[PDB]
Amino acid sequence: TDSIVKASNWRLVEVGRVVLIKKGQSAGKLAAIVEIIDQKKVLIDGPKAGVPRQAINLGQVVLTPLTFALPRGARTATVSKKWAAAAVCEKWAASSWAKKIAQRERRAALTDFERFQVMVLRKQKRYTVKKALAKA
Amino acid sequence: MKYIQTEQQIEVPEGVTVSIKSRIVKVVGPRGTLTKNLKHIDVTFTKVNNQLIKVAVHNGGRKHVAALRTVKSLVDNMITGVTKGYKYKMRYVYAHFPINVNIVEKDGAKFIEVRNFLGDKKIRNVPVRDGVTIEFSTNVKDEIVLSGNSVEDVSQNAADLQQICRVRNKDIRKFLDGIYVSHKGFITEDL
Amino acid sequence: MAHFKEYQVIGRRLPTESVPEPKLFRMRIFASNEVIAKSRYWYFLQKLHKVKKASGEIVSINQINEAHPTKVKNFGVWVRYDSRSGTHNMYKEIRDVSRVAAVETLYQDMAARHRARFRSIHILKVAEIEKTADVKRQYVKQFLTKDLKFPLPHRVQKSTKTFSYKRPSTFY
Amino acid sequence: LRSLTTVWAEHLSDEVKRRFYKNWYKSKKKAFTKYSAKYAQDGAGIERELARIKKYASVVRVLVHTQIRKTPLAQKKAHLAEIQLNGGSISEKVDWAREHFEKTVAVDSVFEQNEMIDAIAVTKGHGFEGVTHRWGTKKLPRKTHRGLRKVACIGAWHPAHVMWSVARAGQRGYHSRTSINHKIYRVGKGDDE
Amino acid sequence: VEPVVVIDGKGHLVGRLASVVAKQLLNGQKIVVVRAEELNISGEFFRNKLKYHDFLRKATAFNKTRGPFHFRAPSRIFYKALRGMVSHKTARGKAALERLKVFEGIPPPYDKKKRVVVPQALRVLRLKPGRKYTTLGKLSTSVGWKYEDVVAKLEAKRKVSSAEYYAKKRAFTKKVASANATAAESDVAKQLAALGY
RNA sequence: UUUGCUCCACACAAUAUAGAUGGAUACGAAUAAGGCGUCCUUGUGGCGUCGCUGAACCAUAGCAGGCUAGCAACGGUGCACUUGGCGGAAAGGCCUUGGGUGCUUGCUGGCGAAUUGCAAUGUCAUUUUGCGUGGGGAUAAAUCAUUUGUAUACGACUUAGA
RNA sequence: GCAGUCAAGCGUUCAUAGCGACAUUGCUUUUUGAUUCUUCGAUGUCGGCUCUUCCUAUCAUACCGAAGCAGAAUUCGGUAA
RNA sequence: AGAACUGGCGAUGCGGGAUGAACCGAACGUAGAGUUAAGGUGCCGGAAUACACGCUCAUCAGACACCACAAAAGGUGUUAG
RNA sequence: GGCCAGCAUCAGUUUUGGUGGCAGGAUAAAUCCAUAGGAAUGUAGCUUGCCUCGGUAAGUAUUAUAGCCUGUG
Ligand SMILES: COC(=O)C[C@](O)(CCCC(C)(C)O)C(=O)O[C@@H]1C(OC)=C[C@]23CCCN2CCc2cc4c(cc2[C@H]13)OCO4
Ligand SMILES: [Mg+2]
Ligand SMILES: [Mg+2]
Ligand SMILES: [Mg+2]
Ligand SMILES: [Mg+2]
Ligand SMILES: [Mg+2]
Ligand SMILES: [Mg+2]
Ligand SMILES: [Mg+2]
Ligand SMILES: [Mg+2]
Ligand SMILES: [Mg+2]
Ligand SMILES: [Mg+2]
Ligand SMILES: [Mg+2]
Ligand SMILES: [Mg+2]
Ligand SMILES: [Mg+2]
Ligand SMILES: [Mg+2]
Ligand SMILES: [Mg+2]
Ligand SMILES: [Mg+2]
Ligand SMILES: [Mg+2]
Ligand SMILES: [Mg+2]
Ligand SMILES: [Mg+2]
Ligand SMILES: [Mg+2]
Ligand SMILES: [Mg+2]
Ligand SMILES: [Mg+2]
Ligand SMILES: [Mg+2]
Ligand SMILES: [Mg+2]
Ligand SMILES: [Mg+2]
Ligand SMILES: [Mg+2]
Ligand SMILES: [Mg+2]
Ligand SMILES: [Mg+2]
Ligand SMILES: [Mg+2]
Ligand SMILES: [Mg+2]
Ligand SMILES: [Mg+2]
Ligand SMILES: [Mg+2]
Ligand SMILES: [Mg+2]
Ligand SMILES: [Mg+2]
Ligand SMILES: [Mg+2]
Ligand SMILES: [Mg+2]
Ligand SMILES: [Mg+2]
Ligand SMILES: [Mg+2]
Ligand SMILES: [Mg+2]
Ligand SMILES: [Mg+2]
Ligand SMILES: [Mg+2]
Ligand SMILES: [Mg+2]
Ligand SMILES: [Mg+2]
Ligand SMILES: [Mg+2]
Ligand SMILES: [Mg+2]
Ligand SMILES: [Mg+2]
Ligand SMILES: [Mg+2]
Ligand SMILES: [Mg+2]
């Protein structure tokens, strides 16, 4: 008989919260929340992915579960220093999310022939799995 | 102006373990258990440690914040109800006709039966609510005594009795007759 | 009125024989283009001096660009405004990253809280609140607390197809 | 509510077979002759129906018909009707129903002395009626041109329509009525002087 | 996209559901709406109750028959919402409505067919949290609909069977996933990963 | 009254069509919370993981998909049969058994395709009906007139007649 | 014609229980006016009788709140057609 | 009801203001392509269930000139001063 | 050459994309680099007080075992 009180556990807007930008010339790019302007606006910076330091509406951005050490109001060079240091890029690269983004991005670049090759493969993979799914 | 975070505390006593999923609160103590639905609210409960829970409202207006505190209390009073318990006291009031109060039962019922109110031939009846129990307090003239694990159920069952004894068609400040809630308290004493 | 630039506008009293080299006065002016900005200049100048555009000349018009356009700043704003039944002086504090941004949302705020269209407002001063704890208005003090962090509850993703096969989730 | 099956008894009195027709004398009287064969084989068909009723069914009604020949009338053609069954349990109900096929039910097993009962029937007929007796409207004065068992104002000028709520001439009686609270003062037995 | 789109009413806002359902029809898309008793309307129950009684008083003075008819069933409350969004007195209008069907609960066929949802009409995506709102079933039964309790009964029964279905399904997909995992690492598997699969 | 009716089978013919052209692909509930896997004390339980859209999943190669041969697997699937069971909210459909039979692009072979001429929807769906044939099955009634008066202006209603 | 706002007064005392001056804002369209837009190749004028339906600014009746409501009686106000 | 100046309707369709003599846009030979005005773009209905900051929850909410009405006076509802 | 089409090269009108070279301005303002000063929503270190062997808190403390601001170049 402990107490057991759920949680509900949200990603936060906080300095050094990495965000995936979704509208604009950046878009698909990551970046870091530096300072914090109002309930609806934050200052972001993403030197590594090439996104300009800027003000941005939180609604244009989506919060990732990644965070890393960042002095609030840190300038661009400082951001790029800590970013690297904190290895955020491999960390994100590694996530189901980015993996899913990379996936469909590939599917979209296939070639009519590549597409055809995929089919032949699936027929093959199906043949052996259907067997497996029948023996135990 | 939308307050970015305000929160409250709910203290937890030695014998009880509150537990909350979605927004459904179950509080279980020495005196039994109480459960109450909070889904109509939007606060976020958080256990910090078996003697402490925090409730909070992110980015809220006045009405929203305003309902933070009343959440705190409603779960507070579940916790106290389940430890000390509640006990509402009522006395009869009548300037000539003795109000006679009994407890009848039909079909497992338990009803509070009020007779001779202001003389009335009419027989008054109020249901006994489940969870609340009723003793006609000995050693006190015309005292009825409702008690239970649930404030809201004893407070209401009392108010049910007092109100079934409204006086019509008379100057009700001269005809003060009725059963009135005369003391609000706890069951377990010294406290 | 639009998406503002900020201009230095300089003008002066058409020269004369007996008074060549007249005094020269400047205004900063928040406006969408330099055409509106010169208009505005003459609008206020005839409220302060004996001139009118007819007998005066604009000397220079230059856009003032924000000093540090990616530094979050606390602005205090003074304004004069006309309500339906009389006129009024105000102070607000707005937190954004440029004065130009700030004036964009002032104008929005006057319009929305006081129903004041752009014609009925006079910016008196816009000035960066240097040291915190001179920040007066609580709807700003709020955002200045150390190690600030807040969640964004109840996420709405925008659907792209009319139909969905899921049931959504506002988790976040 | 919707009916999903009707199970019928094997034999059927002519008085009911009467009811299923308009020209009994000329007819070959084939009504229910294939149905009756459903009994033949063991029982199979009718059990499954009875069974189906039992499984589903939120209410059970009984198809009873009257013994009009035991009656002074000339009518010969009996009266068929459904009667709900309010004794316990859907299953016991159909069991009761099945048990009583071709068998007979008496009044004294539905009504008892001093019982309040209701009467449901079609009101006597009067054919086409004037407004005065049909609606109990006031007689018009004797002086009035072109007659007086009428209504003087059939409506105001607006709505420029005669309205549903004013009395008009027309049929009187042959209405369905449901009278309540008629106390039974006697339940008479036929085999009784 | 599909020959027939079955929409689960539950948790949708009447007029937004109506607004999209109308346009779909007019464009040639057959639609069935289900669980219409679990439809929502913004505003507290008492409001939409009064609103209903305003509708309820409009009738042809001389003949309450010819005047406006008041249907009390949630499906049909909904159909009203729709028909108003459709030029229903043109042939093209009648045409589009015939592509439409609304139901309380989920009766046969459609209950083994998948139902979709309509995000731009989903209450939980649309109403600002905190605002009061209404459930059709509750409204309708307050204006005379007879069949709330039965629908509840039948659904709860339906709702039992389908949890069987699901659980049985969930168990087979677990097998399938197990089956898939041995195939992982094989050549064909690594190859398909290359091609985004 | 000129061999009429019906269910199944195919055949000719007509007549249509609010709009086929790989697949309508099934928990429930909550959203200030959930799905899924796993463990256990089976719980408002532990641990793990997922979302950030169906951009999916399934299917998809072969004269609109011909004629053929072989191997590996023992799987997939069409079809008519047969075993047991479920579903009444409009169930009129879903699942399970077993042999038969067709296909298999799981892999490897032989043969065909042109001249429809550089595009012309290039015709592959499903509605309803009509007429013969022969594989099951079935053999009424209503109306007029007559008649009653529980009915009635006339119709209608309600009785009655081998 | 009907309803407010302010509150000097009235009401033994006490502005507002019940009322309310000097002022002042309104509503209504069974008053009467003002108008002259429709009808002068014609829309049957008053009252009553009959009958339907509607409005509510509610007389009665249901349940209430207030009183300078002891009771009884009354008055004021609400939900009410 | 009666004057001043202009622009209109009358004598005039077309697009918009659902509707409408006079408002807004724009003045007309038969047609093709383009672009717009006034006004619009959830669905009726062609056209963003667009973007952005606030505000507002009404047991008779509100919703676009002319226009198809509301006032004094009040609110410890909420917002900014 | 009768009717209708398809494609190619052009012409008139138009609409919707990709892309190259330049001019302004505070010869953009920023970032960046350099340098001087500074402060706090005060980083290290230090002190002090509780505290399950450090973690907290409230003091000092202006780059230290994070950084930021401001001017000048
Ligand atoms: C002063 O009275 C009249 O003028 C009566 C009458 O002559 C009505 C009699 C008409 C016939 C001959 C058809 O009965 C007449 O011309 O009626 C007009 C008339 O006659 C048809 C119609 C008028 C004008 C429009 C409607 N109204 C109603 C009748 C009427 C009654 C009057 C009246 C005028 C009208 C006229 O003035 C006073 O009361
Ligand atoms: Mg009283
Ligand atoms: Mg009295
Ligand atoms: Mg500047
Ligand atoms: Mg059947
Ligand atoms: Mg007579
Ligand atoms: Mg009479
Ligand atoms: Mg009579
Ligand atoms: Mg009469
Ligand atoms: Mg006469
Ligand atoms: Mg058609
Ligand atoms: Mg989880
Ligand atoms: Mg699980
Ligand atoms: Mg768990
Ligand atoms: Mg899927
Ligand atoms: Mg083949
Ligand atoms: Mg159906
Ligand atoms: Mg081959
Ligand atoms: Mg034949
Ligand atoms: Mg005065
Ligand atoms: Mg007094
Ligand atoms: Mg006095
Ligand atoms: Mg009058
Ligand atoms: Mg005239
Ligand atoms: Mg006149
Ligand atoms: Mg006339
Ligand atoms: Mg005339
Ligand atoms: Mg007339
Ligand atoms: Mg009314
Ligand atoms: Mg009233
Ligand atoms: Mg007094
Ligand atoms: Mg009251
Ligand atoms: Mg009435
Ligand atoms: Mg009424
Ligand atoms: Mg003329
Ligand atoms: Mg014109
Ligand atoms: Mg027009
Ligand atoms: Mg209009
Ligand atoms: Mg103009
Ligand atoms: Mg419409
Ligand atoms: Mg459109
Ligand atoms: Mg757009
Ligand atoms: Mg205006
Ligand atoms: Mg006011
Ligand atoms: Mg206010
Ligand atoms: Mg041609
Ligand atoms: Mg060209
Ligand atoms: Mg260029
Ligand atoms: Mg740091």
Side-chain angles (χ1 to χ4, degrees), chain E residues 2-4 6 10 30 35 92 99 103-115 124 154-155 157-159 162-163 165-166 169-170 174:
Chain E
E2 301 192 331
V4 182
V6 173
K10 174 154 191 296
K30 277 165 216 45
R35 303 222 279 168
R92 170 184 176 246
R99 317 182 174 112
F103 287 100
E104 4 276 341
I106 323 175
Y110 312 101
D111 69 325
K112 309 229 228 303
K113 273 42 178 148
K114 137 151 283 197
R115 34 251 156 219
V124 120
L154 294 170
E155 275 276 286
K157 192 218 281 170
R158 184 219 129 208
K159 253 195 266 288
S162 172
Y165 163 81
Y166 181 82
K169 182 192 205 128
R170 185 178 54 216
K174 200 203 295 180

Side-chain angles (χ1 to χ4, degrees), chain B residues 35-94:
Chain B
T35 57
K36 158 185 293 330
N37 202 288
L38 287 186
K39 299 205 93 110
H40 61 101
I41 238 290
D42 304 300
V43 296
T44 313
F45 282 88
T46 299
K47 176 155 170 200
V48 17
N49 70 71
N50 275 9
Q51 302 83 34
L52 229 211
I53 308 194
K54 292 189 344 171
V55 264
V57 176
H58 306 105
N59 203 25
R62 255 216 157 202
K63 308 309 170 82
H64 198 190
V65 170
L68 217 204
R69 216 336 213 257
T70 130
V71 186
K72 166 182 162 69
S73 312
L74 280 163
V75 181
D76 268 350
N77 300 355
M78 283 183 323
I79 285 183
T80 46
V82 96
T83 51
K84 308 167 175 167
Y86 284 86
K87 177 180 252 240
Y88 275 47
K89 274 153 143 140
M90 304 183 88
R91 286 265 267 311
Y92 313 161
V93 169
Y94 57 97

Side-chain angles (χ1 to χ4, degrees), chain D residues 141-185:
Chain D
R142 161 199 94 77
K143 257 174 156 199
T144 85
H145 198 232
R146 36 183 146 246
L148 60 75
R149 317 197 89 222
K150 305 171 95 175
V151 167
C153 179
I154 243 45
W157 177 330
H158 289 259
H161 300 105
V162 193
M163 317 205 101
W164 75 286
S165 38
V166 344
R168 315 228 86 194
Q171 168 79 22
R172 170 160 95 81
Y174 206 78
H175 308 322
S176 308
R177 298 289 114 115
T178 305
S179 261
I180 65 183
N181 279 322
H182 303 285
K183 209 201 246 305
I184 303 196
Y185 277 3

Side-chain angles (χ1 to χ4, degrees), chain E:
Chain E
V1 58
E2 301 192 331
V4 182
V5 178
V6 173
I7 319 171
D8 193 339
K10 174 154 191 296
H12 289 89
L13 299 183
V14 167
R16 305 232 185 218
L17 190 62
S19 190
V20 341
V21 166
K23 233 289 145 76
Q24 304 274 295
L25 308 167
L26 290 168
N27 285 349
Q29 174 69 81
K30 277 165 216 45
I31 256 107
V32 346
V33 182
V34 282
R35 303 222 279 168
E37 70 279 4
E38 304 270 69
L39 236 43
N40 293 149
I41 313 174
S42 62
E44 89 179 20
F45 173 91
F46 214 71
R47 281 188 70 72
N48 286 314
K49 188 196 217 302
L50 297 160
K51 276 183 162 154
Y52 199 95
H53 282 270
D54 284 328
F55 174 60
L56 214 22
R57 40 191 312 253
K58 300 173 164 21
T60 292
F62 49 88
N63 189 314
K64 261 86 180 177
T65 299
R66 38 222 320 179
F69 307 117
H70 318 79
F71 290 72
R72 328 292 230 263
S75 30
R76 208 132 221 301
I77 264 165
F78 185 39
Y79 184 71
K80 202 196 101 150
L82 257 135
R83 190 243 230 168
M85 274 137 189
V86 146
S87 171
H88 69 98
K89 277 183 181 153
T90 52
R92 170 184 176 246
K94 301 199 186 78
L97 289 169
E98 275 169 19
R99 317 182 174 112
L100 182 50
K101 298 188 226 269
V102 186
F103 287 100
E104 4 276 341
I106 323 175
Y110 312 101
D111 69 325
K112 309 229 228 303
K113 273 42 178 148
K114 137 151 283 197
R115 34 251 156 219
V116 304
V117 293
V118 190
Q120 38 153 245
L122 229 33
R123 183 210 90 222
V124 120
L125 301 182
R126 258 265 123 194
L127 241 59
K128 172 147 119 44
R131 303 273 170 207
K132 282 128 131 41
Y133 65 84
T134 292
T135 297
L136 229 49
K138 246 64 214 177
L139 176 55
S140 276
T141 242
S142 117
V143 282
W145 173 39
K146 315 259 201 76
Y147 305 111
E148 163 154 17
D149 275 352
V150 197
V151 176
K153 197 137 205 163
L154 294 170
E155 275 276 286
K157 192 218 281 170
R158 184 219 129 208
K159 253 195 266 288
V160 148
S161 296
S162 172
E164 245 134 1
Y165 163 81
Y166 181 82
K168 183 170 176 289
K169 182 192 205 128
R170 185 178 54 216
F172 168 84
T173 144
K174 200 203 295 180
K175 274 182 125 49
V176 169
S178 125
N180 219 276
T182 144
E185 226 31 51
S186 80
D187 290 352
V188 51
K190 319 265 285 168
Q191 281 168 272
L192 281 150
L195 301 161
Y197 293 73

